[PDB]
Amino acid sequence: ICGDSTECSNLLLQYGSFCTQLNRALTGIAVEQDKNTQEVFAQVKQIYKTPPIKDFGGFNFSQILPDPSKPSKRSFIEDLLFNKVTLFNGLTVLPPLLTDEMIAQYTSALLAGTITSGWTFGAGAALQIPFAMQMAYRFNGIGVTQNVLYENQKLIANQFNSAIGKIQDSLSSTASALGKLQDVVNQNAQALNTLVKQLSSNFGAISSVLNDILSRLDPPEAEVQIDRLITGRLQSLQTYVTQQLIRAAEIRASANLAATKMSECVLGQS
Amino acid sequence: ETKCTLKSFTVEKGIYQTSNFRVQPTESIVRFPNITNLCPFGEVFNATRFASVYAWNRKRISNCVADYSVLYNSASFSTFKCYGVSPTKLNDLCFTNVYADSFVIRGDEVRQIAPGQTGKIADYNYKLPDDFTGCVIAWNSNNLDSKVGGNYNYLYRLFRKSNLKPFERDISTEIYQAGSTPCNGVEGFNCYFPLQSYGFQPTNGVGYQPYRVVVLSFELLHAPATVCGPKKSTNLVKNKCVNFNFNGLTGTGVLTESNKKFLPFQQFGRDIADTTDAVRDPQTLEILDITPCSFGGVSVITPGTNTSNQVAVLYQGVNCTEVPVAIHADQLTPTWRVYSTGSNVFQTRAGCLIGAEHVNNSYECDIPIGAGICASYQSIIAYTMSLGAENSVAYSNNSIAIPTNFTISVTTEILPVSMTKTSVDCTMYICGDSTECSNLLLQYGSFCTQLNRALTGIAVEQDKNTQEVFAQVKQIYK
Amino acid sequence: FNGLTVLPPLLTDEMIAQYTSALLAGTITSGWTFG
Amino acid sequence: EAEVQIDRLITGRLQSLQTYVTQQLIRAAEIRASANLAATKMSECVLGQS
Amino acid sequence: ICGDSTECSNLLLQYGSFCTQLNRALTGIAVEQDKNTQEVFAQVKQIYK
Amino acid sequence: AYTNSFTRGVYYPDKVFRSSVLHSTQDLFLPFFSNVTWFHAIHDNPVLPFNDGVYFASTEKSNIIRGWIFGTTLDSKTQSLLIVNNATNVVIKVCEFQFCNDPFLGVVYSSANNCTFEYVSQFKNLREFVFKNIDGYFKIYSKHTPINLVRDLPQGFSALEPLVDLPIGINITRFQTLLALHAYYVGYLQPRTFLLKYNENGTITDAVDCALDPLS
Numbered sequence A: 001i002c003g004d005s006t007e008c009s010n011l012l013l014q015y016g017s018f019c020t021q022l023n024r025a026l027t028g029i030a031v032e033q034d035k036n037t038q039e040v041f042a043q044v045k046q047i048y049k050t051p052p053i054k055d056f057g058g059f060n061f062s063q064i065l066p067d068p069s070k071p072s073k074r075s076f077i078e079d080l081l082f083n084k085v086t087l088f089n090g091l092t093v094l095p096p097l098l099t100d101e102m103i104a105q106y107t108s109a110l111l112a113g114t115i116t117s118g119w120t121f122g123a124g125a126a127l128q129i130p131f132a133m134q135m136a137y138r139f140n141g142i143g144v145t146q147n148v149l150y151e152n153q154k155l156i157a158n159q160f161n162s163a164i165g166k167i168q169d170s171l172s173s174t175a176s177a178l179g180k181l182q183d184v185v186n187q188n189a190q191a192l193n194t195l196v197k198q199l200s201s202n203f204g205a206i207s208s209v210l211n212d213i214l215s216r217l218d219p220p221e222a223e224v225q226i227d228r229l230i231t232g233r234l235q236s237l238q239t240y241v242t243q244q245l246i247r248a249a250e251i252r253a254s255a256n257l258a259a260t261k262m263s264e265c266v267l268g269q270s
Numbered sequence B: 001e002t003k004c005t006l007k008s009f010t011v012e013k014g015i016y017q018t019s020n021f022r023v024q025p026t027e028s029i030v031r032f033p034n035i036t037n038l039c040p041f042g043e044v045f046n047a048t049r050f051a052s053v054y055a056w057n058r059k060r061i062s063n064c065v066a067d068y069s070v071l072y073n074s075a076s077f078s079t080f081k082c083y084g085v086s087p088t089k090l091n092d093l094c095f096t097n098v099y100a101d102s103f104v105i106r107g108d109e110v111r112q113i114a115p116g117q118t119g120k121i122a123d124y125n126y127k128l129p130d131d132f133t134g135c136v137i138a139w140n141s142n143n144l145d146s147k148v149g150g151n152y153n154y155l156y157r158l159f160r161k162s163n164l165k166p167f168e169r170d171i172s173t174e175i176y177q178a179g180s181t182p183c184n185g186v187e188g189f190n191c192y193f194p195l196q197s198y199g200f201q202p203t204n205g206v207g208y209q210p211y212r213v214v215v216l217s218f219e220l221l222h223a224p225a226t227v228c229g230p231k232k233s234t235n236l237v238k239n240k241c242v243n244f245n246f247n248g249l250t251g252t253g254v255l256t257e258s259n260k261k262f263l264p265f266q267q268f269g270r271d272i273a274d275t276t277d278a279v280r281d282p283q284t285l286e287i288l289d290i291t292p293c294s295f296g297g298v299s300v301i302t303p304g305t306n307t308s309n310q311v312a313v314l315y316q317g318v319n320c321t322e323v324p325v326a327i328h329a330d331q332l333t334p335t336w337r338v339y340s341t342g343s344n345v346f347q348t349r350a351g352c353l354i355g356a357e358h359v360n361n362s363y364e365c366d367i368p369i370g371a372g373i374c375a376s377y378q379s380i381i382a383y384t385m386s387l388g389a390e391n392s393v394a395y396s397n398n399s400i401a402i403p404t405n406f407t408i409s410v411t412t413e414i415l416p417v418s419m420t421k422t423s424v425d426c427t428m429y430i431c432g433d434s435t436e437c438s439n440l441l442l443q444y445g446s447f448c449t450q451l452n453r454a455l456t457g458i459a460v461e462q463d464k465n466t467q468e469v470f471a472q473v474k475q476i477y478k
Numbered sequence C: 001f002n003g004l005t006v007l008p009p010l011l012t013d014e015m016i017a018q019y020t021s022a023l024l025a026g027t028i029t030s031g032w033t034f035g
Numbered sequence D: 001e002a003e004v005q006i007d008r009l010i011t012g013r014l015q016s017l018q019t020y021v022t023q024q025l026i027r028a029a030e031i032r033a034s035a036n037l038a039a040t041k042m043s044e045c046v047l048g049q050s
Numbered sequence E: 001i002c003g004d005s006t007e008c009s010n011l012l013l014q015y016g017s018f019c020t021q022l023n024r025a026l027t028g029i030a031v032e033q034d035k036n037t038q039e040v041f042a043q044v045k046q047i048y049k
Numbered sequence F: 001a002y003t004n005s006f007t008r009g010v011y012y013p014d015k016v017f018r019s020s021v022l023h024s025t026q027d028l029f030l031p032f033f034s035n036v037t038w039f040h041a042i043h044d045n046p047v048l049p050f051n052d053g054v055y056f057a058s059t060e061k062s063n064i065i066r067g068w069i070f071g072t073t074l075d076s077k078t079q080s081l082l083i084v085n086n087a088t089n090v091v092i093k094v095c096e097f098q099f100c101n102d103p104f105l106g107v108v109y110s111s112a113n114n115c116t117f118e119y120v121s122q123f124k125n126l127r128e129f130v131f132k133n134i135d136g137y138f139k140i141y142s143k144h145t146p147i148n149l150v151r152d153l154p155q156g157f158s159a160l161e162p163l164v165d166l167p168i169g170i171n172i173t174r175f176q177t178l179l180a181l182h183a184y185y186v187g188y189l190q191p192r193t194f195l196l197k198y199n200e201n202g203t204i205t206d207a208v209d210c211a212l213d214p215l216s
């Protein structure tokens, strides 16, 4: 608001203690986002690893499992998703607490745990179980008896592999299937841009820069001009903060829904 | 600082924000172009000859760049006093146009060049208007006028009852014979020539020696500026936080070499939303860059005032090379020097942490920092986040594991359901029992009812919330 | 108390305690049938 | 001039009260969401088996 | 806020672009209100009789 | 005669370097697909009101159209602008000139009373000229290179870069074109807003009208 000017600070200090809330609200929402991602992803106590030799009754998990040759220990689908979407006057952006490496490790641990042990790893100690018996157990829960799976294993394996290949190709080919994340990024960038663009507004003063009017006038009405600029910028900043609060509430609700879905469906059967 | 910003004498374990810091600019650099359109005022003061007092010459001068300081310090002037015009500040004044009136007068006629004055030449030859005129400069010319000058080459008009308007010249020489009754009752006589010759002699005194007089009048705020005074300049400094008026327009930041290319006519550039990023100087015609000086908030990590009395300082988004510059080496207390240099400058992805040593182990932490690292108090050590345990389950083609014993556990879970049903009075907050306050508030519309409705709605909502969350059964069992 | 006030809650703590006691007695003696 | 001074005071205090009311509304909405979740949990995990 | 006037518009245009976002925060919810009722009812692919 | 000016009349509005940014500007411009009064003065120099800026063009690669005289009365009462060429330098005289019936020039002069200012500077070819005079500044563009791809009509996209500006501080409402003794276009421009696209080298590569079509 002041841009390193002493008289601006002198006039601003008489407006009361407003910066305290203007900063505490942003700190609160930032802490909320950090706790939000930590709660969504950190849902396991250990880090399991896939066995070096893989014989999953016929299924092929090569594309979904992480690959050692990849740079950031990421699978193919994660690389496609990252490559799909793509995106300073007192405003700063703080780095997130958890960078992508820990996220990849968490996803790999969850995937290995659900592949090897099933659902018992989310309710105690992980237990080894062959994959075919796990699929028989899962079919037994939707009304189809286990006798069906053990006589149609090859057909199911082929259908699963064909489906996963087709979905990989579709995701690599589908356009605007990731509109939500791009929309969120665009909204945030537009909000920051329209906040930083407000500096050039005249707000009814002589000019948009403090030094010029300070050096071309005298205090009795210079203070009036300064007060007009100050109050205009206060309303602009308050509007931006309120919009940020509303968007943060929306994202919090969405992330809570995502966490519920992840805890219910990944670690069990719905 | 933490205790001040928290307004308490006890501080719990965690990270807190106290203030922010900026890099102070060091010096200033002024850069103006080579060229300076010199104006030929030498031919004005040092002209070979001047006209008479009744027929002085006028010339038009504009679009000039002349310095008033080069003539103020010259001692070849008898006196330099101006009416309302500052001799020193004339170097920083721009005028619409300038008018010069050069002639020669007698020694005692110098004082006649002033507004609201009575004199023969002040009211008969040249009249100063009743407004602002720049000023008059006079100097001795006895070397070229009192010895080699013409005996009758200088003439003054002794014509009365014909007070001329300001800025008026009447070079028409006519015999002054009335030709009517009011001259001795006769026509033809009482004929006096309008012009008379000066009587001057070589070194005859002070009141008769001819003096060269130039009156400079300046017009302001009548037209776009054409004449302005020159100003000084200096060299440039690189790779420092400098504020400047570089090539006119100002700006602050650090200068770096740039590889971009500019069209042969384009002054400067920018990237987004009036943010200058490239300026070229006329002296070098080389493209450069502007980078804003680094700044940012500070943070204090503490393990709790109860347990200990030692803290770790963290600067956000600052490289090592500016850490001694981030906080001045010899401006704060010597206690800030233990947390200024030395110690341990652990530069990480999220700035620089100073005051805590670095260990290459990894354990679970409790005070987050960011970028995957966090610090804890075992002194204070900052390490990398640990994801937890590490084990591999021996998956096999025909092996299963079946539990044989069981345990029963009890867990707790806390959920808020309500807050305090508060309210604020509508007008008592801003009036406090004053009739003038209510009278002025009645002109601001129905803000009162709008503000009062929301609080009542919230209170009823909280009551309904508690009622629906606790009341589920229709009876009471014992 | 210069223009601001705090309204008391509708349900006092005794009612809340009685609700919790009733719920617990029902879930011990009867189980899920009382729901 | 008293009217000018009272105008300034009213403007400032009205802006402050507006900000306070908005913050209270947001916090009340969030608490309502949390209490709805708590009500669902108590209805399901207590009266039966999850 | 102008009521078909020229001086009001001339004085308003120098305040910046408040109305640029004042006219978008409403269109966002206006668009959202259609998806809200579209995704709650359109849960079938055919129409039975 | 009427001719359809497809997309000519786009120039750099300011002296600020940009790159890969779409800039929406509101200045004086010639609308797209405009109508221009093609003149065929070959065996005709009528009085053309300035109307605050005029487009210009030419096709002849010789020295027949030489000077452009501007003013408001074309009389010794008021100073009149005279900008003429000499095949080696360009001379501009703003001093008071009397009326000229059929002045002839080529590689007239009535009087020079009240003289105040002077200026001295340094398929066929195309010379797109755009003049403007506001707040006492009279500035002129130029583009002296055509594209040899299609004959007839001035089609194609190119930018205009300014050369000269003079702080004369005088009023002009009429102008005449001076010929010799023995086909130039004219268009009118009014302040319509445009959208401009900048290249990575700071060169205008595309312009789109903002008040022409709903798609625009």
Ligand SMILES: *[C@@H]1O[C@H](CO)[C@@H](O[C@@H]2O[C@H](CO)[C@@H](O)[C@H](O)[C@H]2NC(C)=O)[C@H](O)[C@H]1NC(C)=O
Residues within 6 Å of the ligand: A059, A060, A061, A062, A063
């Ligand atoms: C699982 O799928 C992957 C990829 O779809 C298969 O990888 C193939 O590996 C061979 C041997 O290097 C290559 O020649 C093929 O080009 C790979 N496939 C593709 C699509 O590039 C892998 O063989 C499959 N495994 C099983 C057991 O089906």
Ligand SMILES: *[C@@H]1O[C@H](CO)[C@@H](O[C@@H]2O[C@H](CO)[C@@H](O)[C@H](O)[C@H]2NC(C)=O)[C@H](O)[C@H]1NC(C)=O
Residues within 6 Å of the ligand: B319, B320, B321
């Ligand atoms: C802090 O500054 C130093 C020196 O300017 C940086 O060290 C150089 O960084 C560049 C990349 O920007 C490398 O190309 C050089 O090899 C580095 N060493 C030199 C120049 O001796 C350092 O990277 C900066 N730190 C941060 C976090 O940006």
Ligand SMILES: *[C@@H]1O[C@H](CO)[C@@H](O[C@@H]2O[C@H](CO)[C@@H](O)[C@H](O)[C@H]2NC(C)=O)[C@H](O)[C@H]1NC(C)=O
Residues within 6 Å of the ligand: B405, B406
């Ligand atoms: C399952 O664990 C429980 C305790 O975790 C075992 O009960 C213990 O048995 C030993 C030997 O009889 C006693 O000394 C302990 O006092 C018992 N503990 C408790 C809490 O009662 C039980 O034996 C285990 N199951 C089996 C089959 O051995």
Ligand SMILES: *[C@@H]1O[C@H](CO)[C@@H](O[C@@H]2O[C@H](CO)[C@@H](O)[C@H](O)[C@H]2NC(C)=O)[C@H](O)[C@H]1NC(C)=O
Residues within 6 Å of the ligand: B261, F200, F201
């Ligand atoms: C833009 O400016 C560049 C700077 O010289 C011109 O030169 C091109 O530079 C790129 C970058 O290395 C090369 O890939 C091109 O081959 C260069 N072109 C030529 C003709 O040398 C470039 O021509 C200019 N114009 C464009 C459209 O890029």
Ligand SMILES: *[C@@H]1O[C@H](CO)[C@@H](O)[C@H](O)[C@H]1NC(C)=O
Residues within 6 Å of the ligand: B033, B034, B035, B282, B283, B284, B285
């Ligand atoms: C004189 O002007 C030229 C023009 O580029 C410049 O290079 C040179 O540095 C200037 N000299 C001085 C002393 O300013």
Ligand SMILES: *[C@@H]1O[C@H](CO)[C@@H](O)[C@H](O)[C@H]1NC(C)=O
Residues within 6 Å of the ligand: B306, B307
């Ligand atoms: C103070 O610290 C000691 C040692 O760490 C601990 O035992 C004690 O519980 C702490 N008390 C409080 C009030 O934090």
Ligand SMILES: *[C@@H]1O[C@H](CO)[C@@H](O)[C@H](O)[C@H]1NC(C)=O
Residues within 6 Å of the ligand: B358, B359, B360
């Ligand atoms: C990492 O561990 C190695 C052990 O070989 C040690 O030498 C090094 O100093 C450690 N890095 C740190 C502490 O930053």
Ligand SMILES: *[C@@H]1O[C@H](CO)[C@@H](O)[C@H](O)[C@H]1NC(C)=O
Residues within 6 Å of the ligand: F002, F004, F033, F034, F035
């Ligand atoms: C103006 O231009 C349009 C489009 O080129 C053309 O159809 C029309 O004949 C021209 N003249 C008039 C008078 O509209």
Ligand SMILES: *[C@@H]1O[C@H](CO)[C@@H](O)[C@H](O)[C@H]1NC(C)=O
Residues within 6 Å of the ligand: F077, F078, F079, F114
């Ligand atoms: C010259 O012409 C200008 C403009 O027509 C006029 O203002 C001025 O009085 C004339 N005479 C002189 C001596 O400048």
Ligand SMILES: *[C@@H]1O[C@H](CO)[C@@H](O)[C@H](O)[C@H]1NC(C)=O
Residues within 6 Å of the ligand: F086, F087, F088, F089, F091
């Ligand atoms: C015009 O150019 C010729 C040479 O081509 C030169 O001699 C003459 O002086 C020029 N005219 C003027 C007015 O400079």
Ligand SMILES: *[C@@H]1O[C@H](CO)[C@@H](O)[C@H](O)[C@H]1NC(C)=O
Residues within 6 Å of the ligand: F136, F169, F170, F171
């Ligand atoms: C335009 O001409 C009028 C004469 O009617 C004159 O008063 C005015 O000053 C002129 N405008 C400019 C900018 O010279």
